[PDB]
């Protein structure tokens, strides 16, 4: 259930939570998922995105 993240692609705010669209490392783009911010352990990828 924990996986290496490759890139943070997008961000949204839904139902009171920030969610990020993640491209998982080694997985095709058809496996991308939105994940709430509490699930993320990739602060430097969020930072790259926020540029």
């Amino acid at each position: 259930e924990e996986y290496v993240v490759e890139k943070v692609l997008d961000r949204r705010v839904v139902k009171g939570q920030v969610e990020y669209l993640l491209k998982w490392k080694g997985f095709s783009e058809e496996h991308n998922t939105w994940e709430p911010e509490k699930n993320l352990d990739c602060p430097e990828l969020i930072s790259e995105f926020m540029k």
Binding site: E1, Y3, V4, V5, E35, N39, D41, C42
Partner: peptide
Amino acid sequence: ARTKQTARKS
């Protein structure tokens, strides 16, 4: 001790 960029998938 090297870091990795990770996340839990719902």
